[PDB]
Design a protein around this ligand. Structure first.
Ligand SMILES: [Mg+2]
Ligand SMILES: [Mg+2]
Ligand SMILES: [Mg+2]
Ligand SMILES: [Mg+2]
Ligand SMILES: [Mg+2]
Ligand SMILES: [Mg+2]
Ligand SMILES: [Mg+2]
Ligand SMILES: [Mg+2]
Ligand SMILES: [Mg+2]
Ligand SMILES: [Mg+2]
Ligand SMILES: [Mg+2]
Ligand SMILES: [Mg+2]
Ligand SMILES: [Mg+2]
Ligand SMILES: [Mg+2]
Ligand SMILES: [Mg+2]
Ligand SMILES: [Mg+2]
Ligand SMILES: [Mg+2]
Ligand SMILES: [Mg+2]
Ligand SMILES: [Mg+2]
Ligand SMILES: [Mg+2]
Ligand SMILES: [Mg+2]
Ligand SMILES: [Zn+2]
Lengths: 154, 60, 96, 81, 126, 102, 109
RNA sequence: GCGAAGAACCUUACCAGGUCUUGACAUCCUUUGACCACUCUGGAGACAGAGCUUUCCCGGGACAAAGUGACAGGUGGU
RNA sequence: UUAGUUGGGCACUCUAAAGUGACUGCCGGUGCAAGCCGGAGGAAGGUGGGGAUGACGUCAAAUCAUCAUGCCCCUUAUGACCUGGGCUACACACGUGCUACAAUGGAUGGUACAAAGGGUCGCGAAGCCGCGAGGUGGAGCCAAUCCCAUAAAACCAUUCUCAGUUCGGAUUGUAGGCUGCAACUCGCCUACAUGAAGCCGGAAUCGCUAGUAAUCGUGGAUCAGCAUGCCACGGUGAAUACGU
């Protein structure tokens, strides 16, 4: 019942070396307990594997990896009288990027290899090739949302 | 059983380890500050009265 | 070649009493440096507010002490007597 | 005394058994000091140690040297639930 | 000359600026060592990149206090205040990025009945 | 499976009293077909003018059951404290089911 | 091999600690008096190296002899009547720690 | 992780054993005015028996020696 | 000068007294007015951030045990002294915390960066000894001067290679240190060895909106000794808020 609605949003600083916004927002996503050095370093070294394994562009390939896992639709369930109906709805521009990084890192921890260094770098390779767990979940979101297209606006 | 207890604490004990501190006004054993030799209750009730120099309520 | 240490709970007495020394000292011992405001030392005492229960409700008290410093370079025969004569009130402690 | 300055032995307990060597386990010793380490001189003697409400007799062996008197006089009375 | 003493958190950084090549001196120690992170290194040059003077002046820094990031923030404010003294014509440029402002964020105080600044002990219904 | 805890003050918690409290509050199981195991807080106190008090708290997950009563003797209060508790279970359960069925 | 089978893929500093009565720190001296480097695989030491270690480890106590000594000490306390005997004989915590809660590592499940 | 901002003896308010009855703590009684402390013995200690000393200061005094009363003392209940 | 050291100077920080500064002050739009939206100046803009401050009253809420006190009760004891024991028990149930279940990690070596406090029957350095907890020693300090007091995470190199293990440390045997007249019931710490449950936790449930949560160290009260509790200090430092 309370609350005034819209609120301000945090800023992002342009990181050196790989000047980008997604990179800076990715560093803070996989950081734990405020250790910037640990989280930042594994990302910078991970881009080396991106160059050595399949060298196209460290700035690129990461790009379309994001634009291949960011969802287009979304489900925001609501409870109606008698039964709860999963209502499909669009995804805003800001949450478009947020749901990408979170899905990237949740399944980068579950990859199952020796180091987080390899695991994160390999995962974006699979996404850049329309494969992997991160790509898989977005299809689940789309399949479920498009299955309930009936009461989309109604 | 307190008048006996206060008198007991005044006189010197068998060894230096038996000795301890007691509140001067009331005489409770727990929570005594040896800067003032008052317990936490007598300290509050008498600091409000403006009789402890320097002591004032702390906002920050 | 004489230093003066002043401490007080209330600076209003301290600053006023400190000024009295400065005027009197320069009468004979003109070589007097200005008072130096040495850092104040503070202590807190958090106390349970209630009597029996309620450890979550407490109360905090403080004790701030202010200090000053007076330095004299070239003394005079009456400067010590002048310092001796000037007796500051209570609430301030002097120390030559 | 758990240090180099030890060991600690109670005076009135130590002196009583010292003059009881002529008895040679002929008299029970009734003492309260539980904080005395058992000496070699105590071996073979029987001492009654206060357990908080009464005196319990213990016969000193050679294996008991270096321990305290109270170790062989249990205080809390536990019998299960 | 060009004193631009700036602060951040618990850090105070007194910076004297002189024309030169671009060498940075911190407590008589090379600045490659004192600031290890290259990410922390770019922010030092923000007042020197809005105005094209990066390869023209030498900074002599005598910082004291605060954590390693704390001196990095306080030295950014240090040069900007000193650089603004060099020429007032840079004020609109630096103000746009918000570099003259001294950040007001400080660590809070602990409160009684709480396990920190705002952390509350676990509540049990029954 | 309910676990009890009686805080007897100014009174002795005799075994017959313990059995009486346990068996009377045990019939609430019929209503709430899955009562997750929870702790019951029961308080008893008697005044100088022969008045008895009972307080019951049964923190079910979404159901905070309470009732407090004052009567003549101890047994009347316990028998009269079921009515206040049974009302709340019937109030809370039938509120959820019928409203979501418009 | 050295009293009992030790791991092969492991390292001599780590493999030795697989016998009762030896530990990480003590493995530093037995690898020092043997004059052999710490970073050596177990399936690399020669007979001359392995011979010195067995000679060095002979002086220190090992399994069996140490296993029986500690049990003998435990037995000595059971019938002497010492307080620790009833703790050992009943399985309750022996040293000075409480029993109202948190004594499961010795009492069991 | 509440009174308890610190339970090995003390704290301690509980229990066992060993002890005292104007009393451990204040007022008014009366004789001396310092009163003790210490060493030895029995001592678990409290306490029982002996010796050295108790020097008050200025008719005043506070304490202490000695027995009596008025009296004291209760962390006993609401 | 080995070192801000010494000589020298308050230039800068710094400490603390007195002042300025933020008041919808100004501008534009909107409104009739309160006001609302945006913008400039500024370090700070809309009660800037945080504290102290808790109206009439409700719960016969808690405290006769901090203190006081009506009435009732005891008084060769329900008052007074001493030693020993207990408040530390244990088939079990619940609440609040600490440590983990490892590779963003363990181990080894090098090194940088704080704030806030305490110290006279007190803090206790250098030096020497011991693997260690610690011992001798006595400098300086009634302290912006000396001590407590080397901050830790972080950074840089090597190694371990996904296992109940070089993870985890409970538990236990032996040998020690320190306080105290005294460490068995019943203290803390050190050395060697033993090596348990535990590989992310069911139903359910808790905290938090920015220097916050999260994480890492530091100090103080009580204190001869003893805190994973309490009260304060700083280092690094997020994600999200469509909306009712
Ligand atoms: Mg003590
Ligand atoms: Mg509560
Ligand atoms: Mg009925
Ligand atoms: Mg303990
Ligand atoms: Mg709490
Ligand atoms: Mg006692
Ligand atoms: Mg005599
Ligand atoms: Mg005598
Ligand atoms: Mg206007
Ligand atoms: Mg504005
Ligand atoms: Mg107000
Ligand atoms: Mg009531
Ligand atoms: Mg009550
Ligand atoms: Mg009373
Ligand atoms: Mg307790
Ligand atoms: Mg380990
Ligand atoms: Mg012990
Ligand atoms: Mg070990
Ligand atoms: Mg298992
Ligand atoms: Mg595993
Ligand atoms: Mg301590
Ligand atoms: Zn008091």
């Amino acid at each position: 019942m309370p609350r005034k609605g819209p609120v301000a949003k945090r800023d992002v600083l342009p990181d050196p070396i790989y000047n980008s916004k997604l990179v800076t927002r990715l560093i803070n996503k996989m950081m734990v307990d405020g250790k910037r050095g640990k989280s930042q370093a594994i990302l910078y070294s991970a881009f080396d594997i991106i160059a050595q394994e399949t060298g196209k562009d460290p700035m690129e390939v990461f790009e379309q990896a994001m634009k291949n896992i960011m969802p287009l639709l979304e489900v925001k369930a609501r409870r109606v009288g008698g039964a709860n109906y999963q209502v499909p709805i669009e995804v805003r521009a800001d949450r478009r990027s947020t749901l990408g990084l979170r899905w990237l890192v949740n399944y980068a921890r579950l990859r199952g290899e020796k180091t987080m260094e390899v695991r994160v770098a390999r995962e974006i390779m699979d996404a850049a090739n329309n494969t992997g767990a991160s790509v898989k979940k977005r299809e689940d979101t789309h399949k479920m949302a498009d299955a309930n297209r009936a009461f989309a606006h109604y | 059983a307190k008048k006996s207890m206060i008198a007991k604490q005044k006189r010197t004990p068998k060894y230096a380890v038996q000795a301890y501190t007691r509140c001067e006004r009331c005489g409770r054993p727990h929570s005594v500050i040896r800067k003032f030799k008052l317990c936490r209750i007598c300290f509050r009730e008498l600091a409000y009265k403006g009789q402890i120099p320097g002591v004032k309520k702390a906002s920050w | 070649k004489i230093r003066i240490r002043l401490k007080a709970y209330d600076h209003r007495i301290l600053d006023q009493s400190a000024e009295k020394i400065v005027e009197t000292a320069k009468r004979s011992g003109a070589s007097v440096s200005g008072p130096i405001p040495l850092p104040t030392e503070k202590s807190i005492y958090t106390v349970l507010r209630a009597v029996h229960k309620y450890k979550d409700s407490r109360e905090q008290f403080e004790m701030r002490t202010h200090k000053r410093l007076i330095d004299i370079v070239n003394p005079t025969p009456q400067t010590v007597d002048s310092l001796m004569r000037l007796d500051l009130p209570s609430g301030v402690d002097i120390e030559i | 005394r758990s240090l180099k300055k030890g060991p600690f032995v109670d005076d009135h307990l130590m002196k009583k058994v010292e003059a009881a060597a002529e008895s040679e386990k002929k008299q029970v010793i009734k003492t309260w000091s539980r904080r005395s380490t058992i000496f070699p001189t105590f071996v073979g003697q029987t001492i009654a140690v206060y357990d908080g409400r009464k005196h319990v007799p213990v016969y000193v062996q050679e294996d008991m040297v270096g321990h305290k008197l109270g170790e062989f006089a249990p205080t809390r009375t536990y019998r299960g639930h | 000359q060009y004193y631009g003493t700036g602060r951040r958190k618990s850090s105070v950084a007194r910076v004297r600026l002189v024309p030169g090549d671009g060498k940075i001196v911190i407590n008589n120690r090379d600045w490659e060592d004192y600031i290890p992170f290259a990410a922390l290194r770019e922010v030092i040059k923000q007042p020197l990149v809005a105005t094209e003077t990066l390869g023209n002046y030498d900074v002599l820094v005598n910082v004291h206090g605060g954590g390693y990031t704390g001196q990095a923030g306080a030295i950014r404010h240090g040069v900007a205040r000193a650089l603004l003294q060099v020429a007032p014509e840079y004020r609109p440029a630096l103000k746009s990025a918000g570099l003259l402002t001294r950040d007001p964020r400080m660590k809070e105080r602990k409160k009684y009945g709480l396990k920190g600044a705002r952390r509350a002990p676990q509540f049990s219904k029954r | 499976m309910l676990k009890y805890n009686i805080r007897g003050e100014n009174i002795e918690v005799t075994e017959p009293i313990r059995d009486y409290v346990e068996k009377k509050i045990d019939k609430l199981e019929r209503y709430f077909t899955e009562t997750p195991d929870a702790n019951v807080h029961v308080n008893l106190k008697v005044y100088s003018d022969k008045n008895a008090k009972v307080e019951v708290t049964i923190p079910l997950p979404n159901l905070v059951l309470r009732a407090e009563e004052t009567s003549g003797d101890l047994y009347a209060s316990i028998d009269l404290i079921v009515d206040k508790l049974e009302r709340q279970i019937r109030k809370h359960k039938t509120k959820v089911n019928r409203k979501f069925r418009d | 091999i050295a009293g009992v089978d030790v791991p092969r893929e492991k390292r001599i500093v780590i493999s030795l600690t697989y016998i009762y009565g030896i530990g990480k720190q003590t493995a530093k001296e037995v690898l020092a008096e043997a004059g052999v480097s710490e970073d050596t695989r177990t399936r690399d030491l020669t007979e001359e190296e392995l011979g010195k270690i067995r000679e060095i480890l002979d002086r220190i106590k090992v399994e069996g002899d140490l296993r029986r000594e500690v049990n003998l000490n435990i037995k000595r306390l059971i019938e002497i009547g010492s307080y620790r005997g009833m703790r050992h004989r009943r399985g309750l915590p022996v040293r000075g720690q409480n029993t109202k809660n948190n004594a499961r590592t010795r009492k069991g499940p």
